[PDB]
Design a protein around this ligand. Structure first.
Ligand code: KWJ
Length: 317
């Protein structure tokens, strides 16, 4: 009960918001202050945590730095995108309840997460779906990377559909995002003592497993594991998630021979070539290396040609 329904809160820019019903975490629907109350079709949410919470601070800094509405709209215009799946930041402030200090932030409201939809579809997405999701995710990753950040936890539960457009997917949850290149100086290949967050074990990068700070190649690697999970319903190491050593060992061995990962994950000889080629390309990245995002997108587009489709932006969920 951090907020009352109908409570009006004011952000640092003196913009007024009204809180709606609660919705993982402490999150409520929200809208611009008005006489009417906040509908079930509200266009915003408000995320609230104690002011001493580290993740919300990390997240807020990400949103302020790289997710300003104009900043995003400029990129979309320049890169000629249909949309960009980075949630827009609308504001933030402080809020007292019962004598303790809380930090809040206002973001875009979305529809369903992809994990619910994945489960509802018997833990499979079509090749078409996976390729269309992945092309959009590569747009997102390129954007955040160019703004000095990596996400480090890409997965279906952090991917939400636009409330008004089911063909547009957004990456959320920047609470453990990492500023890999502050002021254009890439972090060295070593642990960051301020970070102890390892990601989601089934999907996380070999770099994260090794205890080094996440970088761009790691985000791409994570997406790779997601693509296989979505296509097949499985990953090779999924029965041993309690043992990080095992998971790391398996990922390293599979990275060494991608063909054997394809043989393991796909029924013999049925392996989509673009997935192998994607994984081969990511494997060649150095820790500090800037990915060629267009080449990666090109690889996935060949997959769309192979199934007699095109990048029409249809997710087919
Ligand atoms: C009503 C409804 C649908 N709906 C939900 O059911 C669930 C999935 N959640 C919470 C989560 C995740 C939602 N979250 C948002 N918005 C944002 C935006 C930015 C972030 C961010 O950076 N971290 N979490 C975020 C949630 N919109 C709708 C939902």
């Amino acid at each position: 009960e951090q907020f009352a329904v109908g409570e009006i809160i004011t952000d640092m820019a003196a913009a007024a918001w009204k809180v709606g019903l609660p919705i993982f975490g402490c999150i409520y629907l929200a809208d611009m202050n008005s006489s009417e109350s906040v509908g079930s079709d509200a266009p915003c949410v408000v995320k609230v945590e104690p002011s001493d919470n580290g993740p919300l601070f990390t997240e807020l800094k990400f949103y302020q730095r790289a997710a300003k509405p104009e900043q995003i709209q400029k990129w979309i215009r320049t890169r000629k995108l249909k949309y960009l799946g980075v949630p827009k930041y609308w504001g933030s402030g402080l809020h007292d309840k019962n004598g303790k200090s809380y930090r809040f932030m206002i973001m875009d409201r979305f529809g369903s997460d992809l994990q619910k939809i994945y489960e509802a579809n018997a833990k499979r997405f079509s090749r078409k779906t996976v390729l269309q999701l992945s092309l959009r995710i590569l747009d997102i990753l390129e954007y955040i990377h160019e703004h000095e950040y990596v996400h480090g936890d890409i997965k279906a539960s952090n991917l939400l559909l636009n409330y008004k457009n089911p063909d547009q997917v957004y990456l959320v949850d920047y609470g453990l995002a990492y500023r890999y290149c502050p002021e254009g100086v890439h972090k060295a290949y070593a642990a960051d003592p301020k970070r102890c967050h390892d990601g989601t074990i089934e999907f996380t990068s070999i770099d994260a497993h090794n205890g080094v700070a996440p970088s761009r190649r790691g985000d791409l690697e994570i997406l790779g594991y997601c693509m296989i999970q979505w296509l097949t319903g499985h990953l090779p190491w999924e029965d041993n998630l309690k043992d990080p050593k095992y998971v790391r060992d398996s990922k390293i061995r599979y990275r060494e021979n991608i063909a054997s990962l394809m043989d393991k994950c796909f029924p013999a000889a049925n392996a989509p070539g673009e997935i192998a080629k994607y994984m081969e390309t990511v494997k060649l990245l150095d820790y500090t290396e800037k990915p060629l995002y267009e080449n990666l997108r090109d690889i996935l587009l060949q997959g769309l040609k192979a199934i007699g489709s095109k990048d029409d932006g249809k997710l087919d969920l």
